[model samples]
Target: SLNITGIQSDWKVEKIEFAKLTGERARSAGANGRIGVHGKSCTVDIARITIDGQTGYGSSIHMTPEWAEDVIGRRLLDLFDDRGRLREAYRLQLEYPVLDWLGQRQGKPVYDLVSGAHLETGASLVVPCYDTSLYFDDLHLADERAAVALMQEEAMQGYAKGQRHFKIKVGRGGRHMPLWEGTKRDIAIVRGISEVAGPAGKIMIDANNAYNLNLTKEVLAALSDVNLYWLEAAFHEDEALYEDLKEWLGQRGQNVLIADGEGLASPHLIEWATRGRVDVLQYDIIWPGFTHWMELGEKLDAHGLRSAPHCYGNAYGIYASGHLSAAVRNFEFVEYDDITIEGMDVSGYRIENGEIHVPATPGFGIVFDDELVTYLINRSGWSEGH
Candidate 1:
C-alpha cells in the first residue's frame, strides 16, 4: 500500500545544524557565460537533520541554522506523507535531508523509497553522466592555437575521471568578446575538442542564450563533420525559432538534439516539448527538489521527452541527480560537476565509462564525519537536542 505506516511516524526532529563546506573543483573553471568565471572552489551550506537516532545530510543553498531551528520539534508525519513524500507546506531545502532520514528510518535506499522496483532485484543502478567542466577557457589566451590546446587539455581531465561524453559552453559572441571573433572562437574550439573526443565520444554544446538562428547554423555548418549531440539555450525557447532550427537540422541530416529549460524557463515548456519544438527538459534538480522531479519524471515519460536536470554549480546536486533514474524511465543524463566537499563521505558512489554508479545504501549513502560535525557545532552552528 502507498500508506507508509509503523515506520517511525512519531519520530521527532531532535537536532538541526548548518555546516558551511568548501568544495574544491578538479581545476579552475573558466568563464562559461557573458560575465562570471567559475573559480577552482565553491561554498555549500549543508543542513544536518537529526531525527530519532538517525541523521540526514542535505546540500542547502540559503538554509541557515536560524531558518531551520523552528523545525526541531516537529514530527516525521508533519513533514512527510505516508509514502515518505514531503507535504506541500514544507520548503524545498528540507528535501534531501528528509529523504535521507526517511530512507534510513525505513531501511531502504532513497531511490527504492521513492520507487519500489529495487526491492525485488536489490541491485544498484548506473545513470549516464557527462563531463560538464568545459567552459570558455580559451578567452584568456591571445593565440588561437594556445586557446584550443587549453580546452582540449581541460577535457582530458574529465576523461581521466571516466566520463566519455562532454558538454562545451558555446555562445561567446553575445558578451565576452567581439561578435565575429567570439563566434569564430567557438567554432574553432569545437573543432579542436572534436578531434580529441574522436568518433566514440559524445559532445553537447550550451550557448546560454548567446546565439541567434543564423549564428547557430553557421557554427554547426562549419563543423558539419563533427557529431554534435545536442545544442542547449540556443537563443532562448521560442516555438518558431526551435521549429526552424529543427527543420534546418533535418534538411542537413544532422541528428543534433535541441535542449532547453534551465534558467528563465517558459510556463509553456512542457507544451512546447509535446509539439516537438524541444528534445530535452533541464529543470534545476535542487530548486524544484526531489518530489517535484518524482512527479515531473512520470509526465515526461508519458510524453516521450527526456530529462537531464541541471545540477551545475553545487557538488551535491550532481550526486542527488543520479537518484532520479530510479523512478524516471526517460531520465537521461546526470550533469556531473566534479567537486570534493570537506566532511562528507561520498565513497559509495563513483563515475565509470560515462555513468554514475548510484549506491544502494540508505540515506543517499552519505555520512557526515563526526569530528567535522562536532567542530562545526563547536565553532558556529545551531543545535536543539542530543
Candidate 2:
C-alpha cells in the first residue's frame, strides 16, 4: 500500500452525468444485473499548486470522489492511521488524482508512479484484450441457433479486429425451458463458437449464473468437448457457491477453470485467495477504485490467481484497465466491450495483433476528446477545495 512517497493533492469533483440505459440487455433484468444501469461518471480535479505555482486535474467510476476533497486535506501521515475500509477506500481514491498529478509533475505515467519493478513498456507493454457479447434478454430469448451465429460472427469480427480472445453469452435456460432447453442451447452455442474460434483464438462462455448448482455439473460435463478456456459463473452475492463449485470441480478433477468475483467486496477476496479459490478474478476499478485494484492484484498474485478488470460501462474504465494491466503483471486480459465507447479520444489507444496499447504519455496516457465529452449532459459545483 506504500510505494510512492511525498504525495498530496487539493481534491474536488463533479458528477457529470448519471442516467439509465436501455438496450437489448434490458429485455431481462436477471442477466448480469437488472437489465441495465445508472450510468455514473465524474471528473476529479486534484491540484498540486507546486512551490513554483502550478495546478493539475485528474479523475472514479460509479462514485464521485467528493470524499477525497476531505480525505486529501488531512495530513498524508494521518491517512495511514485509520484502517477502516469504507472511507479508506475513498481515501485511496482521492490519492489517485494526487498520484496522477504527481506523476504528471514528475514526467512519468501513473503506472510508473507506484510500479515497483512491475512495468511492461513498448511491445512488452502491449496487452491482450477479449471481445465480449452479452445482452439482458439472453435468458428470456434463449435462441441457441441465433446465439451460435451471433457469437461465431462476432468471434470472427473480433479476430479480424485483432482480438484473439472472445467471450459469448450462453446458458440462462435454468428452470424454465423443458428438459433444460436453455442449458442445451448454451451447450450448442459453445460448440459453434469453439469451432469458429478454432485453434488460433480462444472462446469462453458466461452463464450469468443461470445454471443452478446441480445443473452446472451437467452443463460442465456436457461442455467437456468444447475445450473452453474457462467458464465465468459470475457470482457476487453468493460467493460460497463459487467456492463449492471450485471444490466440486477439483474433487472431480475437472481441468476447466471456474471464474467469479466481479463486484465483490475486498474481504471476500482474502477468503477466496486464502482458500485458493478462483482461477480468475474480475475486480473492476469501480468497486475498490484503482488504488485497491492494484493492491488486490498483488494479493491475488501471491495466491497465484489471474485477473481481468470488468470494463463494461464508462469509457474511462477501459483506459483505466490498460493502466492497471500495465502496472500489475498478473492481469491476464483487459475486458474490451465490443460496442464503441460513446465519447473519448481513443486515437492513441490501439488494438493491434490482438493486443492493446495505451498512449505512452505521462499519467495514464488517456486523452479524452473535450468536444465529444461536451455531448455528455453536464453538471457542476463540487469544485471548491484547496
Candidate 3:
C-alpha cells in the first residue's frame, strides 16, 4: 500500500488599477481590466510516495481561478491511498502526450513545454511557489500609500535577512499619467529609494511599456541624473525600437541596460534573443509554463543574456520562479512585488544578501496556510474538496 493525500483548492480575487498597465496603449484600452490576480488556485489531488519517504505531488490549474478550484476540489475528494491506482489514473490522463506532438513539430524534445507546464500547473496544484522577488512601481508608490508602507515593511524584513537588490516600477507618464507628472514622480521615488537603499543597493526601473522611441529619449534624458542599473520596457513591440533604444542609451553613456519581453510568448523570445534586441529577457511561468522557459533560459544563456521571471501570481509563482532560476545558469534575479506578499505567509524560505533560498522539501516545498485557505474559501463560498 502507498500513502496518498488530498487537499482542497482555494480561490480569491485581487484587483489592479489601469495605471499599473505597462506598454504603449495598454492603459488606453480601458479604465479597468481583470487580472487573474491569484496565479493558479488549485488542489493537490495525489502524492506519490516511496519506501525511502520520497514523495511527489500531482497538481493542475484550469486557467481560471473558479475553474481551478472547482476541478481541483472535486479531484481531491477522489483521492485514493493506493499508489498504483493513482499512478494509473494520472497516466490515463495522458499529461505528457501533448509534449510528444510538440516535440515532433519542433524537431526537439519540447522540454520547454514539459518544464513550463509542469512547474506552473504543479505549483498551482500542490504547495504554493514564490515567483521571484517583489518590485515597487512609482504609480503604486504614489497612489497606493499602503504600497509605500508595504515597501518599508519588506525592506525591513529583507534587510534583516541581508537582501539588497530592489527593483522599482517607472515609465507610466506617457501613457497612464501626464508625461511630466509621471517622470517627476518616477525620479522622486527613485531618489527616495536610493537615499534609503544607499549606493550599495541596486535599483532597476520598469516603464511597463509606457514610452515610445522618441518619448523614451526624452524620458531617459530627464532621468539622466539618477543612476539606474537598468531601464526596462521603454519600447512596446518593435525590435527595431529596442535596437534603436539600446544604441541611444549607449550613445548617451547611460550604461543603464534595457530589459523587456514579459508579455512575449516562447516563440517570440527566440526571435527577440536572435536579434540582440533586449538586455534582460523577462518570462512569466503562468502563461507558457516552466518547461518552455527552461529551453528559453538555455537559449538566453547561449546568447550571453540575462533572464528574469515576471511574477504576478501569488506565492506559488515565487517558488516556481526560484526553482527555475536555480536551474538556469543565465538566470538573473527574480522580480518581486510587495503588493502580492502582503496577505501571504513566507515561513519555510529565507532571503539573505538579495538571494532567495529554495525549499529543499519534496515538490514545490511550501505548504498552504490552513487559515488563509479557510478565509479564501469563505470569501468565495467555495466548499472544501468541492
Candidate 4:
C-alpha cells in the first residue's frame, strides 16, 4: 500500500458542486411512475481543482457531504493519483475528476488508459449490454400478479427493440396473498422475468441486498427452477452466503451465477473481492474512477472471475463503462438503463439483439452537443462552472 501522507498536497479545490441530471419519466411519472422510472435523477459531483493556473474537472455519482469533495479532493494533490482513503464516498468524490485530470495530463481519454487497448484509440470497439431499466419501485411491489404483468410488458417492449438481454428488479412483495407472503412474491418475480426473457434473451436479477440470507436461499432455490443468468446482491456481499449457496447448489446439481460488489463504497472492498469465491464482480466505473477500476478488473481476471460494470446511469456513465467492457475480451455486460435520461444526444450508439455497442471512435464515443450538458446544469441550478 502506498503511504497515504506522501500524496501530492499542493492542489487547491477551486469550485465544487454536485451536478444533477434529470430522468424524464422520473419527473413526469408522478406517483405511478415507480414501475418504469425510479431514480428520476443521477447526481455526479463536479470537482474543479487548480494548481498553478492549470485546472481540470471530473464527474462522479459518488455522492457525499458537500464538504467532503474539497476535504478529500486534496488527496489529488499527492505525488501519485490514488483512491486510498478509509472513507466511503469521500475518497471517491475526489477520484473522478483527478483521474480525469490525470488522463488530460497523459493527453488521453481515461477509458483508453484503463483498457490496455491501443493507447489513444479504441476504434470500432463495440460493447454488449442487457437493455437495462425495469425498476420495481416501492409501490411497484404491491401486487405480484401485476408485477408479473409489468415484467411481461417491459420484456415485450425491449424484445421489440431487438434486445435479447434484460434486467429486472426483484425483492419483497407478494402475490394474491400480500405482506407475510414474502418469498412468494420474490420467487414469482424470478419466474415472471426469466420466462419473459424466453431463453434467447438473458435475464439477471438485482435485489440490492433487500433479502436476508434465508430469504435469499429460498429465492435462489426457486430461481434454480428458472434459468436465470445471474442473481445480484442476493444477500449483501457475504462470503459465507455467496460461497455456501453456490457450493450448496452445485452439490445438488444446480448452476446459478451469484453476483455482488457494485456498492463497494470503500477501497477495502477491492481487497475483499480478491479473497473470496466471488463468482461475479459488478464494479461501478463511476465510483471507483478509471484507475482503480482497471487495477481491480485485472486482479479479478487472473482468478477467472468475470466483471460486469454497473452502468445504470446517464450517457457519460453508460458509454464510459461501455469502453472498458468493450476493451476487455469477455466482459459479461455493461448495464444499459431503462430510465429516460433527457438532455443528452444518443447519436453514435447502436443496439442489436439487446446488446449495445459503443461507437468505434476514440474515447467514450457518444458525441455530446454542449446544449445537452448545459441543459442538465441549468436544471440543477449549480451556479458553479459546468
Candidate 5:
C-alpha cells in the first residue's frame, strides 16, 4: 500500500464551469426529447478539490454550497476509507475528485487505487473502444440514399480516428418518421454502415426503447448478415419481452448481446442479467457514479456478466470509463465519444486501432491545460471556492 501516515488533510474546494466540446452535433432518438438533440458545446460544472498542495478535479453538476461546506475542511481519511473508497455517507460526485487526489498524492494511476493492481510497469493499458458518435444527423435529408450516405460519412470520420466498432443510433420510427418508413430507414442505415465498415469492422445499434419486439426481430432478421455486436434498449426493458427475444435469437442463432440501463433504468435489470435477459449493464458513468459502477461491476462479475458503462455526451467520461475497464473484470468496450474541452489536457490518453491507451500517469491521467485554466479563472472569475 502507498504511504500517507500523518499527512496534513485540510481541504479547499473550487467549482469551475466550462464548455464541453463535442466535435460534432449529436441528434439522438426521442425519449421525451431527453437525448433528442445537443449542440457542439454545452456548459459543464466541475469541482476541483485540493488537499495540502495536490489538486484533483471531477464533474460536479449537482454540487452545492452546503455540500461544499461539508467537504471544505474534512480530513482525507475521514472522507475516504484506508483503501481509498469514498465513505458511504458522502455523495457520489466527490468520488471523482477524491480518487483523483489519492492517485496524484501517491503517484499512482486511479485504477491502481481502485483495484489495488499496483503493477511495476509504466506501460499503458489498452482497452477496446467503440465510436458512439453516430447520431440521427440525417433526419433532415428527404432522400433515403442520401440519408444513409450521410450516416456513412459520419462513421468514416470515426474510422479515420482509429475506431473499429460503430454504435449507430436507431429508433427514428418512434419519433421522427412513420413507424414502417422509419424502420425501413433504420435498416438502410445499418446496411450502409455495414457495407462501408467492411466485414472486419464491428457494428452495433441502439434503439433507445423505440422498437417493439416484432420490429426488433424484423430489424435483426433484415441485418442478420451484418452480425451486430449488440442491440441496446430495443423497446423499454421488460422481463417477458427480453426473455422472448433472447429465446427467439437463440433459436435463430443470432448471438448479438442485449444492452440496456442508462436513463431512469430499474434495479430489476440486475436480476434480469442474472437470469440471462440482459448481457450488458450501461449505468451512466457519472449519474449515480463511478463507485456504484465498481460495486455493480463486482456483482456482475460474480454472475459472469459484463459492464459497458454509458459514457456518452460527457468528454471526461470517455477517459474515466477506460480507467474503470482496467479494474472491472468483463468490462466491455468504452463508449468513446470523441470530444474535447478547453483547459482540459487529456494528452496522456490516446485512441489507437479501436482501443483507448490509458497512460499510467498519476491521477485520472488528465492535466489542466495551463492557458485555458488561466483564462477560465480570469474570466467570470472564481464562482465558488471554500
Candidate 6:
C-alpha cells in the first residue's frame, strides 16, 4: 500500500562576492588575471523541498532560480503532482518490468525492486559543482590571489574532515589566451595542496568545454606530473577525437581517465556510453529526472563504466544524489562542493574519516533549520519578491 499526503515548493538565492586578486589591475595574460574588487555579482537559485510528507519514497529538483521556476514548473510539475507521479512511476516500472529488457540489452543483471526502496537505502552519487569561474578570472578583477587562497582554505578544511576529492573550474567567461598559464597555475595549486594533504588526496579539473585539440594537449602535458585521476574536457565532443584520444592515452601508458556527459542528457548519454567515449559518466537527477538517470546508470554498469551524479548547491541535492549512489553498484564517488557547506549550516551529518554516514531519518534524512531559512529569506529579500 502507498500513500501520498503533502507537497510544497519554495525558492531562494544566495549572493557571493570576492576580494580583489591584487592591488593593481592590468592586462596580464596569465592564470591570475589582473582585476579590481567589486561587490558580489552572481546569485545561486535554490528550490527548497517542493515535495514532502512521504515514507519510503521522496524526490526533488534543484537548479538556477529562473530555470527552477520557469522551466520546471512549465515542464516537470505540470505533468503530475511531484509526489504522486514519483510513486506512480515507481509502480508502473514494477508492473511493466522494462528494466529487465534494458539490462538484457546492455548485458547486465536486472534489479528486482526498482522503485520500492527508500532514499536512505539507496547509493550516494556525489557530483562536484563549481558553478562559475567568473569570479576567479584575474583579468577583469584584482582579487585572483584572494580567490585562490579562499579555495585553498576551504579545501584544507574539507580535507581535514575526510573530504579527499575536489573539482576545480576552468573555461569560459574569460579571455582564452591565458588558459595555458591558468592551467599551469592550477596545477601548481594542486601540487601545493597535495603537499599539504600528502600523497593520498585526489583532484579533478573541469575545463567546462574550454579547450581545443592543441591547447588541450599542451595543458595535459603541463599537468602530466600532477598525477590527476582524470583530465576532464581536454577536447570538445567529437566522437572520432574521443576515440583517438582514448587510444593515444592508452598507448602512452597514461591511466589518466577522460570524463564527460554532464551536458549529454538521456538518449545522447546512451549513445556516448555505447561508443565508449567517456570512462566516467556524470549526470544530474534534476535535469533528466531520477527515473531516467537510473536507466542510464544501468547502461553504464553493463559497459563496465562508472557514474557519479553532478550535485551542487544545497542539502536537497546532496541528499538526493547520496541516496541514488547508495542504491547503485557501479557508482564511483560523489562530488561534494564546499559551497553547500559554507552557505548552510549542515551540522547534522557526521563526516568520519572521509565517509559521509547516511542519516537514518525518513526521506532525505536531513532537516533544514527554519531559523536559518527565515534569516536567509529576510537577508536576501526573497520574501519581498514573492
Whole-model lDDT values for every prediction: 0.81, 0.56, 0.47, 0.57, 0.76, 0.46
Q: Which ten residues in a row have the lowest lDDT in candidate 2?
A: 20-29
Off-target runs (Cα >4 Å) in candidate 1 are 1-6, 61-67, 82-84, 116-120
| Ranked candidates (TM-score, high to low) | 1, 5, 2, 4, 6, 3
**What are the per-model C-alpha RMSD values against the true structure?**
2.1, 5.6, 11.9, 6.3, 3.3, 10.9
lDDT tens per residue, model 5, 1-386: 22345345554343422222223323332222125655566344566666765677766556555656666555666766776456666645577776787788788887766662423345567889998877788778889999999889888888888888899888888887888888899999989988877887889899888889999999999999995999998988998999999999999999899999998898699898899999998999987678777777878888999899997667778878988876688888999876656667788888888888998888798886545654664564243443
| lDDT, candidate 1, at 52 | 90
87-180: candidate 1 lDDT, tens digit per residue: 7555476778777777777777777766634334477678899999898888878788898899998888788889889999988888998899
Residue-level lDDT of model 3, residues 88-112, one tens digit each, is 2423221222222223323332223
The clash count of every prediction, one per candidate, is 0, 4, 26, 10, 0, 27
Q: lDDT by residue for model 6 over 265-298, one digit each (tens)?
A: 4356447657776777777645554455566666
The local lDDT score (0 to 100) that residue 14 gets in candidate 6 is 19
**How big is the positional error of residue 331 in model 6, measured in Å on the Cα after superposition?**
1.0
Question: Which candidate's TM-score is highest?
Answer: 1
Off by over 4 Å in 4: 1-21, 25-113, 117-123, 137-144, 173-180, 264-276, 313-315, 326-330, 339-342, 371-386
Better of 4 and 6 by TM-score: 4
Top candidate (lDDT): 1
| Per-model TM-score versus the true fold | 0.94, 0.74, 0.60, 0.70, 0.89, 0.61
lDDT for predicted candidate 1 compared with the true structure: 0.81
As a whole number from 0 to 100, the lDDT of residue 169 in candidate 5 is 85
The regions of model 6 sitting more than 4 angstroms off are 1-151, 171-180, 264-269, 313-315, 339-346, 369-386
lDDT of 6 at 68: 30
Worst 10 residues of 3 by lDDT: 13-22
lDDT of 2 by residue, 160-274 (tens): 7777777766654643445466567767766776786676666677766566677777877787766667777633424577678778878877777667666445466657655
By lDDT, the better pick of 1 and 5 is: 1
